[PDB]
Design an enzyme around this catalytic site. Structure first.
Site, PDB file in Angstrom:
ATOM      1  N   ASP A  65     -12.003   1.076  14.326  1.00 59.17           N
ATOM      2  CA  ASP A  65     -11.953  -0.370  14.274  1.00 59.17           C
ATOM      3  C   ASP A  65     -10.539  -0.909  14.554  1.00 59.17           C
ATOM      4  O   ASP A  65      -9.545  -0.221  14.332  1.00 59.17           O
ATOM      5  CB  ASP A  65     -12.443  -0.873  12.923  1.00 59.17           C
ATOM      6  CG  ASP A  65     -11.544  -0.446  11.796  1.00 59.17           C
ATOM      7  OD1 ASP A  65     -10.792  -1.292  11.266  1.00 59.17           O
ATOM      8  OD2 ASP A  65     -11.571   0.752  11.459  1.00 59.17           O
ATOM      9  N   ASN A  82      -3.382  -5.551  12.461  1.00 54.80           N
ATOM     10  CA  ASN A  82      -2.719  -4.465  13.192  1.00 54.80           C
ATOM     11  C   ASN A  82      -2.391  -4.820  14.635  1.00 54.80           C
ATOM     12  O   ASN A  82      -2.175  -3.934  15.440  1.00 54.80           O
ATOM     13  CB  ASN A  82      -3.579  -3.194  13.146  1.00 54.80           C
ATOM     14  CG  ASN A  82      -3.790  -2.679  11.715  1.00 54.80           C
ATOM     15  OD1 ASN A  82      -3.048  -3.030  10.773  1.00 54.80           O
ATOM     16  ND2 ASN A  82      -4.791  -1.849  11.548  1.00 54.80           N
ATOM     17  N   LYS A  93       0.816  -1.239   0.000  1.00 49.78           N
ATOM     18  CA  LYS A  93       0.000   0.000   0.000  1.00 49.78           C
ATOM     19  C   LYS A  93       0.840   1.275   0.000  1.00 49.78           C
ATOM     20  O   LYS A  93       1.465   1.614  -1.010  1.00 49.78           O
ATOM     21  CB  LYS A  93      -1.032   0.027   1.151  1.00 49.78           C
ATOM     22  CG  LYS A  93      -1.717  -1.311   1.437  1.00 49.78           C
ATOM     23  CD  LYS A  93      -2.129  -1.400   2.911  1.00 49.78           C
ATOM     24  CE  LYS A  93      -1.450  -2.597   3.614  1.00 49.78           C
ATOM     25  NZ  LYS A  93       0.020  -2.362   3.870  1.00 49.78           N
TER      26      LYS A  93
END
Ligand code: P9J
Length: 249
Positions: free
Chosen positions: A131, A136, A18
């Site tokens: 969230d 993560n 990303k």
């Protein structure tokens, strides 16, 4: 306290994609081991995210808890932004979950506790978190989890609550319910094949449990996944839940 790319030695890439990858790194003068997250500027301004970084960073730089990933600093060059991060050597809870298929009752309660503490701590300092995905969630040297996202303030559908997909403070509790389920069953309760359908499932709160799920876990999960925010437990009552105290190291 200006850092520059020449104060570090970069090593093995730890993870990708990303905005840019994360490299293992060590500061030349002190030999401190840590993580460098690299983010190409241009490529983040053009996704309009530029500004939210500065704020989540500002927010993170002042955050200190043993289940929150430390942010030691940041710096920029001509082209790039670099974040200087605590290094967590046991990898992600996500990859652990892929390896073990599903966790057991002891490991789940333990993680849920460590997260609940990290979120109580957050609220006191009037910080609230969006969230929380397993992607993560890193693990430290002693196996303890650390929240590693930059998503605070003063989740490709799966982890988002009904509030954030229809038309806070209680979003956290919904997060624990989704994570608590995923830990024991090995995939999140509203997983579908399309965005369209995951949206319906979350919006209506459609989930069922496989048969191996003990009543205590059902009972906690069902208390946290309520459509209406105010019907969700306070963080405290989650820390003292019969099934939690029985199973949490
Ligand atoms: C920010 C950070 C990462 C980290 N350690 C690791 N991070 N990530 C990871 C995964 C996806 C995307 C980026 C990194 C890893 O796969 C990983 C695997 C084994 C050991 C450590 C790590 N420590 N601190």
């Amino acid at each position: 306290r200006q850092w520059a790319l020449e104060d570090f030695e970069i090593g093995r890439p730890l993870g990708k994609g990303k905005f840019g990858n994360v490299y293992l790194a060590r500061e030349k003068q002190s030999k401190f081991i840590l993580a460098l997250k690299v983010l190409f500027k241009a490529q983040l301004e053009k996704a309009g995210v530029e500004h939210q970084l500065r704020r989540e960073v500002e927010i993170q730089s002042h955050l200190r808890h043993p289940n929150i990933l430390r942010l030691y600093g940041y710096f920029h060059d001509a082209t790039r932004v670099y974040l200087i991060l605590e290094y967590a050597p046991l990898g992600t809870v996500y990859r652990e979950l892929q390896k073990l298929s599903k966790f057991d009752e002891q490991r789940t309660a333990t993680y849920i506790t460590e997260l609940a503490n990290a979120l109580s701590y957050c609220h006191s300092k009037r910080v609230i978190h969006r969230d929380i995905k397993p992607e993560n969630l890193l693990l430290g040297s002693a196996g303890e989890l650390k929240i590693a996202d930059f998503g605070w303030s003063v989740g490709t559908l799966d982890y988002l609550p009904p509030e954030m997909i229809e038309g806070d403070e209680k979003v956290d509790l919904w997060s624990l319910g989704v994570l608590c389920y995923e830990f024991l069953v090995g995939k999140p309760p509203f997983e579908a094949n399309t965005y369209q359908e995951t949206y319906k499932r979350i919006s209506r709160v459609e989930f069922t449990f496989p048969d191996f799920v003990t009543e205590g876990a059902r009972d906690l999960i069902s208390r946290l996944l309520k459509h209406n925010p105010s019907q969700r437990p306070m963080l405290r009552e989650v820390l003292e839940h019969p099934w939690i105290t029985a199973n949490s190291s």
